[PDB]
Amino acid sequence: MHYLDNLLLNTDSYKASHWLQYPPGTDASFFYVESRGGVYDQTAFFGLQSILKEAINRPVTHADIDDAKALLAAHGEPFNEAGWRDIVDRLGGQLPIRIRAVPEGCVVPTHNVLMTIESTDAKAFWVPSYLETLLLRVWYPVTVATVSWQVKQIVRDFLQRTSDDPEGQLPFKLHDFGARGVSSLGSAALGGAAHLVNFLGTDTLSALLLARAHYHTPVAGYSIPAAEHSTITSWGREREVDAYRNMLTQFARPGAIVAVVSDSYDIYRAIREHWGTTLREEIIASGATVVIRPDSGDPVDVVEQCLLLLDEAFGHQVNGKGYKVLNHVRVIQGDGINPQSLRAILERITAAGYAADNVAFGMGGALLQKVDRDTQKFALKCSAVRVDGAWIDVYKDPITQSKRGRLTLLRDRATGQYRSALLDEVATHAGDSDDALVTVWENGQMLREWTLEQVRAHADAARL
Amino acid sequence: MHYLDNLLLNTDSYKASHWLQYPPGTDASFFYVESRGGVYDQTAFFGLQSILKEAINRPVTHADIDDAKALLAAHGEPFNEAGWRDIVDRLGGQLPIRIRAVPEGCVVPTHNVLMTIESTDAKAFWVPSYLETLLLRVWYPVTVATVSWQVKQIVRDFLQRTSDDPEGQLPFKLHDFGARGVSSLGSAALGGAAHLVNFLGTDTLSALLLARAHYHTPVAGYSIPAAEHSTITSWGREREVDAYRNMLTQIVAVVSDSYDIYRAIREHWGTTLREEIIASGATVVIRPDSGDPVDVVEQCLLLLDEAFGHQVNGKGYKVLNHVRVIQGDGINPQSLRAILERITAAGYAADNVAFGMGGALLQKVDRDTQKFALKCSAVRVDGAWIDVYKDPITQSKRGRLTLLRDRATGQYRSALLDEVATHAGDSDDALVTVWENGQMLREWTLEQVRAHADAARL
Numbered sequence: 071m072h073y074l075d076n077l078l079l080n081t082d083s084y085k086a087s088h089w090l091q092y093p094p095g096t097d098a099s100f101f102y103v104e105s106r107g108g109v110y111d112q113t114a115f116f117g118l119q120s121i122l123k124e125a126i127n128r129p130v131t132h133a134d135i136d137d138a139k140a141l142l143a144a145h146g147e148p149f150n151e152a153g154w155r156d157i158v159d160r161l162g163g164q165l166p167i168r169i170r171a172v173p174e175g176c177v178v179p180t181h182n183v184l185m186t187i188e189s190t191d192a193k194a195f196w197v198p199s200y201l202e203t204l205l206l207r208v209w210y211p212v213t214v215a216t217v218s219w220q221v222k223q224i225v226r227d228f229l230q231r232t233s234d235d236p237e238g239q240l241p242f243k244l245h246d247f248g249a250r251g252v253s254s255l256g257s258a259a260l261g262g263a264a265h266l267v268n269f270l271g272t273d274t275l276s277a278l279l280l281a282r283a284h285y286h287t288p289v290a291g292y293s294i295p296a297a298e299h300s301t302i303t304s305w306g307r308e309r310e311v312d313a314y315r316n317m318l319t320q321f322a323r324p325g326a327i328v329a330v331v332s333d334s335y336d337i338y339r340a341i342r343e344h345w346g347t348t349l350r351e352e353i354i355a356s357g358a359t360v361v362i363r364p365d366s367g368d369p370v371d372v373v374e375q376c377l378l379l380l381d382e383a384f385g386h387q388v389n390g391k392g393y394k395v396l397n398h399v400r401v402i403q404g405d406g407i408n409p410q411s412l413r414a415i416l417e418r419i420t421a422a423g424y425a426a427d428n429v430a431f432g433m434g435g436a437l438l439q440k441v442d443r444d445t446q447k448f449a450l451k452c453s454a455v456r457v458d459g460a461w462i463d464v465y466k467d468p469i470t471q472s473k474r475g476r477l478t479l480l481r482d483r484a485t486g487q488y489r490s491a492l493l494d495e496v497a498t499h500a501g502d503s504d505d506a507l508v509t510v511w512e513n514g515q516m517l518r519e520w521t522l523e524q525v526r527a528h529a530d531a532a533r534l
Numbered sequence: 535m536h537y538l539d540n541l542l543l544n545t546d547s548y549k550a551s552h553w554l555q556y557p558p559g560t561d562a563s564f565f566y567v568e569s570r571g572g573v574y575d576q577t578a579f580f581g582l583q584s585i586l587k588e589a590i591n592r593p594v595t596h597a598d599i600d601d602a603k604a605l606l607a608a609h610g611e612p613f614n615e616a617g618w619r620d621i622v623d624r625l626g627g628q629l630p631i632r633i634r635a636v637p638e639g640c641v642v643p644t645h646n647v648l649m650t651i652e653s654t655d656a657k658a659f660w661v662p663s664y665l666e667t668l669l670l671r672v673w674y675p676v677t678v679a680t681v682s683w684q685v686k687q688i689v690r691d692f693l694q695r696t697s698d699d700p701e702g703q704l705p706f707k708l709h710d711f712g713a714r715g716v717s718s719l720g721s722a723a724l725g726g727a728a729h730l731v732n733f734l735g736t737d738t739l740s741a742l743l744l745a746r747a748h749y750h751t752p753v754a755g756y757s758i759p760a761a762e763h764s765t766i767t768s769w770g771r772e773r774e775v776d777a778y779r780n781m782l783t784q785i786v787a788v789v790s791d792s793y794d795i796y797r798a799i800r801e802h803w804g805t806t807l808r809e810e811i812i813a814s815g816a817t818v819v820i821r822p823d824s825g826d827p828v829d830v831v832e833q834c835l836l837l838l839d840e841a842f843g844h845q846v847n848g849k850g851y852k853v854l855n856h857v858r859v860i861q862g863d864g865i866n867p868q869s870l871r872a873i874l875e876r877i878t879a880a881g882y883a884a885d886n887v888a889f890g891m892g893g894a895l896l897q898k899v900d901r902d903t904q905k906f907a908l909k910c911s912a913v914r915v916d917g918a919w920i921d922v923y924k925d926p927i928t929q930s931k932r933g934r935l936t937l938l939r940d941r942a943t944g945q946y947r948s949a950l951l952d953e954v955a956t957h958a959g960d961s962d963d964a965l966v967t968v969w970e971n972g973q974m975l976r977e978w979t980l981e982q983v984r985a986h987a988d989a990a991r992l
């Protein structure tokens with residue numbers, strides 16, 4: 071909200087003093103971003119466009135400088151008032167930087183240049199380092215998009231093995247439940263949008279708002295009516311069956327999908343005791359698909375048990391791949407879901423002869439919150455600075471060979487393989503490779519911009 | 535920003551469908567929040583005030599309803615357009631709910647009522663569950679405040695054992711470095727403020743902005759200038775000395791290693807620098823950036839002792855002259871305790887060292903850390919209140935609830951509202967009404983929150 075609308079204070083304190091630490095005669099700087107490794111060997115790049123639209127949404131003003139000067143002096147940090155006033159008076163408050171990035175949605179192996187940031191003004195050379203804090207938080211949507219993309223490859227493998235329509239089923243198989251389990255509204259919106267790079271299903275309404283505001287997508291994803299277990303219990307134990315019947319009355323129509331939550335024990339009770347007969351009849355009669363969500367028991371075992379019991383209650387058809395597809399009902403597991411338990415569910419139910427069509431997964435905190443900057447070892451590093459007119463390589467260690475100088479990313483035309491390279495190598499390899507970065511932002515203006523459908527196309531084409 | 539400024543869409547999709555799911559005759563609902571366990575046995579309550587000011591900052595409007603109606607229909611959810619229009623037309627867009635909470639900064643054992651949410655209008659009885667999503671995210675400031683408070687008790691223990699001024703040293707002992715390692719600007723601001731419940735030092739400027747806007751505190755915390763990876767061996771590696779010593783020109787923080795202090799002792803380029811450090815007279819804070827966290831702190835201390843000497847304090851522990859060490863890598867409750875155990879066994883006061891945490895403080899927490907839950911405990915149907923619960927025994931909390939504090943001992947317990955009157959001689963109702971029907975009632979400064987947190991002990 072309004073209280074955070076000062077770019078000059080959107081940084082680590084010690085970076086305010088940073089411009090005093092450069093050698094004399096410095097007049098340019100050059101930084102890049104990469105994943106240095108971590109959980110996965112490749113990352114889906116996403117979220118920079120939102121960060122730039124939201125964190126740099128207007129020119130810097132003299133009022134911003136007044137406010138920052140007062141706060142930083144009371145807080146304990148030096149502040150380059152004169153440098154920022156020059157940016158406001160001479161450059162219209164527009165940040166003198168150029169940002170290039172790989173198109174959002176592309177999946178890039180680790181240890182590769184994902185973005186670069188370069189100063190465009192000799193006197194205000196220090197601006198890139200000032201933005202390190204807000205830019206480096208691109209680790210978050212990158213890492214969430216990556217986790218969701220890795221899960222998609224797992225689900226896709228099993229649908230390719232067991233489903234007659236793998237790519238028609240896939241977009242609905244991982245549903246975001248994480249809005250209550252993430253650390254803030256802004257994180258829900260941006261993290262939720264990172265999941266929508268890969269899937270259509272979300273309960274995180276905030277992600278629809280961000281996709282609509284920042285990625286030109288009015289309705290980025292979908293959901294269905296679903297029961298809350300507490301409101302079921304509030305009918306009392308004697309009318310428990312009537313609460314589920316009300317769910318059908320309100321929402322079960324032909325072509326409609328509605329989700330019901332129940333503990334595992336009560337699902338077994340309804341499939342044995344004869345009060346479930348009325349329930350089975352109205353389910354069949356409605357023409358809807360009813361998704362059952364078990365919310366107790368071992369996350370893996372209970373799915374297989376639901377499939378076996380629902381099979382006994384509703385029957386199945388055998389599809390073209392030889393796998394069973396339940397009639398009328400499906401299962402979603404929203405508990406204990408992370409990439410490892412999800413795979414374990416898929417291995418277990420397909421070994422039992424059930425199509426992956428039968429099952430979907432809800433992920434909450436494990437999707438939006440249980441990630442950190444170390445997950446994909448995200449880093450923003452200075453690789454070159456210009457002193458007295460000469461560019462000099464900057465680096466910590468010489469060998470992982472270490473990236474230095476003014477860098478870019480290349481894509482091999484024949485193989486599609488990515489590699490990092492000096493800007494001077496784009497000319498010499500013009501026949502076999504193309505520069506894979508694009509200029510997304512320069513001197514206060516966003517240049518290349520994506521819709522979410524464009525991002526989704528890049529990510530969907532990538533495979534393991 | 536402005537694109538998230540519709541409260542009607544600050545919820546889980548399925549909540550749009552939820553009001554149709556209640557039994558006939560329902561006209562009230564009651565919810566409570568608690569920590570069901572997890573890493574720590576007690577939690578510092580913090581952050582609800584910020585959530586309420588930011589997420590419910592204005593009355594709901596007809597434009598809000600138009601927008602939510604269009605989006606939810608296209609998204610796939612039914613929408614209670616008539617119920618929301620009623621709230622706007624009849625109740626001025628003010629949510630008919632009452633929120634009660636333990637005063638922020640209080641530290642409460644797990645499995646206890648920390649806040650309650652109750653409907654105040656028979657027609658709009660379904661509003662509390664609609665807000666569960668944005669209210670349950672209070673898990674985050676609670677959990678960051680708790681991790682920070684737990685660290686504070688460890689440092690307090692060692693300062694009490696080894697320092698002449700424990701409570702004067704303590705507020706500077708854990709510094710927040712997490713702004714680049716947290717998932718968003720909003721999380722930086724609120725998680726950073728949660729740390730400032732317990733300490734004064736932060737590099738997270740966003741936290742100062744939040745404390746100023748939401749907790750009435752203009753300058754909630756402080757820092758000092760420091761050096762970097764980026765620029766001091768960017769001078770060249772032939773002239774790092776005059777690069778690190780170009781900020782002796784302007785307390786300050788310099789980034790070294792433990793071998794670098796040893797070399798500075800051995801060669802003459804350091805024998806002059808010891809002069810310049812004491813000829814400056816400023817306290818130099820050294821942050822190591824490599825090595826095992828426990829070993830590098832002890833080694834830096836012994837080496838700095840050789841270089842600068844010490845004084846022996848009233849408790850018999852050494853306090854270095856001119857220099858201090860802050861360890862900002864690899865810190866958590868476990869390794870922070872190990873550093874303190876090592877240096878105090880080596881005879882050094884806890885005054886000598888401070889700690890930094892980044893993502894380990896602001897990002898490496900989740901809703902499961904303290905098993906945070908928001909639960910419906912009662913509904914009113916056909917004029918009668920009934921208990922709501924899953925499993926009957928832990929005994930299991932149900933009904934309209936509150937939190938009590940024993941007057942003699944200060945110990946907390948959860949209870950039915952029935953029992954505040956019958957135990958009025960021995961106990962006080964420990965919740966306060968913080969919000970009702972669109973108005974924030976009880977409100978805290980950050981200094982008040984700090985007072986509650988500081989008084990609580992293990």
Ligand SMILES: NC(=O)c1cccnc1
Pocket residue numbers: 246247248273296297329404546548
């Ligand atoms: N739609 C759901 O069933 C849901 C959403 C968010 C969290 N938990 C469950």
Ligand SMILES: NC(=O)c1cccnc1
Pocket residue numbers: 242243245271293294296329361400401402430
């Ligand atoms: N795709 C699904 O099965 C589902 C289930 C429950 C809630 N949202 C989606």
